[PDB]
Amino acid sequence: SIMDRSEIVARENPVITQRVTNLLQTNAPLLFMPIDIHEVRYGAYTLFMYGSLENGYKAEVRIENIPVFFDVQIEFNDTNQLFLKSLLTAENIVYERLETLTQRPVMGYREKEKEFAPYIRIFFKSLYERRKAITYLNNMGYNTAADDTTCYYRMVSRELKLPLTSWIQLQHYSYEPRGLVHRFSVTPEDLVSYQNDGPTDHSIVMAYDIETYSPVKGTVPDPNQANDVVFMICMRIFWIHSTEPLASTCITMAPCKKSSEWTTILCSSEKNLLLSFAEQFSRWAPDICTGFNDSRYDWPFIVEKSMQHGILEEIFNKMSLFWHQKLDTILKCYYVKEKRVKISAEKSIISSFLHTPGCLPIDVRNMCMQLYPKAEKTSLKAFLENCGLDSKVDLPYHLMWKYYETRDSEKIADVAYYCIIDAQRCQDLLVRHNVIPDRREVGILSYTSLYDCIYYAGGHKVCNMLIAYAIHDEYGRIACSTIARGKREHGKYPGAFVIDPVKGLEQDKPTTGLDFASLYPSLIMAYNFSPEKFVASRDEANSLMAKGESLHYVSFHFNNRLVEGWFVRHNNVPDKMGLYPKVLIDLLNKRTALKQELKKLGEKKECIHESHPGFKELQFRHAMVDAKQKALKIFMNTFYGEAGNNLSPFFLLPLAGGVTSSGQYNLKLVYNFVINKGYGIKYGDTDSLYITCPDSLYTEVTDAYLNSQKTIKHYEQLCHEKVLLSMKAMSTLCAEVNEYLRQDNGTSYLRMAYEEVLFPVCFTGKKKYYGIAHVNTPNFNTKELFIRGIDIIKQGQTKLTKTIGTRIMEESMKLRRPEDHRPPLIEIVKTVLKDAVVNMKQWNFEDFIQTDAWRPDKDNKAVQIFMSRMHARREQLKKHGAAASQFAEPEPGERFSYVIVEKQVSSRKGDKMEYVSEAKAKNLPIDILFYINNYVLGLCARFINENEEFQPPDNVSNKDEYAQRRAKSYLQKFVQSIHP
DNA sequence: TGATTACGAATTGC
DNA sequence: AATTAAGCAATTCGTAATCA
Ligand SMILES: Cc1cn([C@H]2C[C@H](O)[C@@H](COP(=O)(O)OP(=O)(O)OP(=O)(O)O)O2)c(=O)[nH]c1=O
Numbered sequence A: 001s002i003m004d005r006s007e008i009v010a011r012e013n014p015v016i017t018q019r020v021t022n023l024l025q026t027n028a029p030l031l032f033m034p035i036d037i038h039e040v041r042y043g044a045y046t047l048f049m050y051g052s053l054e055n056g057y058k059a060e061v062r063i064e065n066i067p068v069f070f071d072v073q074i075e076f077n078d079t080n081q082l083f084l085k086s087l088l089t090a091e092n093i094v095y096e097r098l099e100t101l102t103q104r105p106v107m108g109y110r111e112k113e114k115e116f117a118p119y120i121r122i123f124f125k126s127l128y129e130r131r132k133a134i135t136y137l138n139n140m141g142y143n144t145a146a147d148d149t150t151c152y153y154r155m156v157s158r159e160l161k162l163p164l165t166s167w168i169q170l171q172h173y174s175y176e177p178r179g180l181v182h183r184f185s186v187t188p189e190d191l192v193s194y195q196n197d198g199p200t201d202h203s204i205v206m207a208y209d210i211e212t213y214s215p216v217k218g219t220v221p222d223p224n225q226a227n228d229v230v231f232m233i234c235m236r237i238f239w240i241h242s243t244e245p246l247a248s249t250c251i252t253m254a255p256c257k258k259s260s261e262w263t264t265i266l267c268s269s270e271k272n273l274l275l276s277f278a279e280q281f282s283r284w285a286p287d288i289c290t291g292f293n294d295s296r297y298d299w300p301f302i303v304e305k306s307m308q309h310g311i312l313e314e315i316f317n318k319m320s321l322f323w324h325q326k327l328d329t330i331l332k333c334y335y336v337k338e339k340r341v342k343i344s345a346e347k348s349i350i351s352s353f354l355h356t357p358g359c360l361p362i363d364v365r366n367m368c369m370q371l372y373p374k375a376e377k378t379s380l381k382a383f384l385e386n387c388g389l390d391s392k393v394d395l396p397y398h399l400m401w402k403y404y405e406t407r408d409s410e411k412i413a414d415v416a417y418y419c420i421i422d423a424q425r426c427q428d429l430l431v432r433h434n435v436i437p438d439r440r441e442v443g444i445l446s447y448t449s450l451y452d453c454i455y456y457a458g459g460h461k462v463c464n465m466l467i468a469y470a471i472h473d474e475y476g477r478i479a480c481s482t483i484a485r486g487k488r489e490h491g492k493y494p495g496a497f498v499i500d501p502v503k504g505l506e507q508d509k510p511t512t513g514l515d516f517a518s519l520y521p522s523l524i525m526a527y528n529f530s531p532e533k534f535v536a537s538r539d540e541a542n543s544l545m546a547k548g549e550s551l552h553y554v555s556f557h558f559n560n561r562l563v564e565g566w567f568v569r570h571n572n573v574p575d576k577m578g579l580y581p582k583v584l585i586d587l588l589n590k591r592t593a594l595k596q597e598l599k600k601l602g603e604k605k606e607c608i609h610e611s612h613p614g615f616k617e618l619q620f621r622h623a624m625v626d627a628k629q630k631a632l633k634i635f636m637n638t639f640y641g642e643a644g645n646n647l648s649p650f651f652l653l654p655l656a657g658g659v660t661s662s663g664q665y666n667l668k669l670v671y672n673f674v675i676n677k678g679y680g681i682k683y684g685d686t687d688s689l690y691i692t693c694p695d696s697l698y699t700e701v702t703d704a705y706l707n708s709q710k711t712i713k714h715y716e717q718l719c720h721e722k723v724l725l726s727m728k729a730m731s732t733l734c735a736e737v738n739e740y741l742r743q744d745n746g747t748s749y750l751r752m753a754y755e756e757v758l759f760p761v762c763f764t765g766k767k768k769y770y771g772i773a774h775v776n777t778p779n780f781n782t783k784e785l786f787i788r789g790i791d792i793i794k795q796g797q798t799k800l801t802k803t804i805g806t807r808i809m810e811e812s813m814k815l816r817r818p819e820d821h822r823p824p825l826i827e828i829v830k831t832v833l834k835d836a837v838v839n840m841k842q843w844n845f846e847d848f849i850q851t852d853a854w855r856p857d858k859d860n861k862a863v864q865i866f867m868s869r870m871h872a873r874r875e876q877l878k879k880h881g882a883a884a885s886q887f888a889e890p891e892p893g894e895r896f897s898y899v900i901v902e903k904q905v906s907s908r909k910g911d912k913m914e915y916v917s918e919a920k921a922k923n924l925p926i927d928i929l930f931y932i933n934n935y936v937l938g939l940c941a942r943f944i945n946e947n948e949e950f951q952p953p954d955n956v957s958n959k960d961e962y963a964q965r966r967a968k969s970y971l972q973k974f975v976q977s978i979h980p
Numbered sequence B: 001t002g003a004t005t006a007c008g009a010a011t012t013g014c
Numbered sequence C: 001a002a003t004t005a006a007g008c009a010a011t012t013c014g015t016a017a018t019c020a
């Protein structure tokens, strides 16, 4: 009415607008960039793409004549063709035509003279008949290729070499201008991808938020009940790579003062507000729609209110660019309820939204959680202050209630300001973390749409990339399937190897750790762990060796059974390399380049002091590059992870077994080689290996120091020299080890890498060590203390244990001279524990709060009694009549904080748990002895495990557990003795 | 009534 | 007329059942 998309994009980019108008009039090739994808199942299959032109115009491009087909193996016999077509038509399925071709299977190894196998491809119209035919043929027991039953645009993208998340060049099109949209009709032989670097791109993203009200005190509004009401919606538009806005709108009910920044629309009813929201959405036509926590509170609220008022059809049809749809179809198809999104290996979240064609909905909270999966606080303030942005953009709810009760224009203006800022913060986060281009690159690399890049995990991306590389091979075309097959067994196969540490504190010999770089991918490259190079029979392996090939033998144990196999090597020939090695080789170069850039950035940063204003930006850029290379690393490891997954089409147990066995063999070989040279090895884990230097290297500096006055500065100089010679010797040792490995295997893929020097160091057990880190130059007056799994870095831990652990750890590394007093670890632990238990007046009501997750599906024992107790208390409170919202159950999958108090006359956790607010209201003094005896004793016993008096005789097998029990008992007796 | 054990759940390190 | 989801090794706590 006042300002639409076309006028804005013409005002912003006039020259590009004039250019695009000229090309449209002349009917010249254009550029297009997609965001959203939609397709039709019944009837003729046409693919819909919604996106942007160069200047900013919104366009929709429909592709017709996309072939629909799928492949089966069988044979070329005409009798087979007739039999298959008779079977297919016997179940009321209509097909178009049949074709024959030749392809190489993916499973098994064949010689050159019998490599190619026949295939029959069946064509179809509409996806429904194709899916039914695939299911029927697979159930009948026929091998099939292609085989993508869930989504079909992935197959189109991987077959036509047309990324759905990049620029596309339009040639020889049909054009029709309809209102604000530009209908484009194309044909697959048209198009093609844009190889060069495209322009800056111009897409529109709208961030929105809402504010609601309820008449009953202290309750979150619920759409199901009457009254309540949603009473403000504010929205703002932006480019895809910019923070400055283009337009902003506020829709409200109560009167408010006019503001120069935004436009205000005044309604007089709840229906009017939703209608105006839909109208403004239709006029702007966002390409992306965003809001914070909108998938759990906002969208269901609007949808439920609309159904209550019965205006869902109008809103959906005005927002959507697709054709008319009825209410039942909207409810069944375009309204998603309870969708599962994966965050970590043991976490998931539930999302629900409304999907209008022509716009993609994105939740900022999901992206932030996926970026930082180990964060206890998951609110806007926490994520906003983590990245370095300005926090404190929130408003109390009671103040909002009072302001709505008063019905004053200034208060409504203030709440409008706050919700506008809330809308802005989402775009701030999205631009700061650079989210959309990263997912864009992932989709380009994996041949997948952006919706999948936002709402899905990485296994299917791996499968799609493997199939895409297989079908485009230089020496043929390889057929791959997506449907899993074979019997599913329960169990685990052996893997990894950990070396028993020489426990204790080392303050005289520097220790250096060397590890393999990309161990498992390198093993795959070196030994050809590929499905097409696998031999299962012994006779075949014997014959292949007789002819003159080279094979790798694998054997291990699984479920009281021997698993045995062979693989074929490539002896440094490009023609003989497998498919997994090709993909991993292509992926490794990107990580190498990013690592070089990271090293250059670190070198540049090392020359800048902390006081310079530019230090924070350099730190941020360094962190982002590190995150990118870690993201590549996890994607690379997902290949091995999926190779052993029981639900994937690429399941092959011998591959994973051989990978793990070869890792163990290489680690043991390097261990023996280093031992037989005079060095001492203190630790090992999977690939990392920690070594110490001989005693003859430091003779000169030792003799020089022994003839001096023996002051502290002299010992500091001696330590500096020790570390320098340690690095100098370790470089040569690494070079010799790499040469030995290269001679052993015959290939340069496997290689060891230098990390750092740890001096002084302490090993408290398996997977538990700490020390001071030296990278390139010695430096001792630092506070960083490495730390790897010392139980003070976990999630559900109180501040008390962290403080005690830090106090103990930072005291054992103070660089004491040999001639001075060198105190053991036991006295440090005892002194810290005694100063903790005694003098308890140093702890406040902040060191005892601990957080835990509430998962109803999981059983647990302690939380499920606390929940029942709170439910009974709530029922008792509601009986007489009182407020009971203080004891509301947390949302499933979320974490809650709690404290432990004293219960009079029990003796169980869960009968003493209380909420933080309830405890603060009613004092409820804390039991400190419970915290001590249940949490500090284990850590303190782990520190002093190494001592001799706790050791078992030679008969006991598991010495570590026995020693831990004895240390815990000894410390328990000590703590009972010091203060009853 | 005490000591000991077994199994699920939680969380880190590769 | 409906559907996701990489692997294993190692330690620590918490409650109920069985054993002297
Ligand atoms: C981190 C990680 C490792 N692993 C396994 C496979 C790896 O080969 C093995 C050891 O990996 P690391 O030695 O931790 O790392 P890397 O060798 O892959 O790379 P870099 O040295 O540059 O850090 O751990 C997984 O299976 N999944 C994972 O998520």
Ligand SMILES: [Mg+2]
Residues within 6 Å of the ligand: A515, A516, A517, A518, A519, A687, A688
């Ligand atoms: Mg490594």
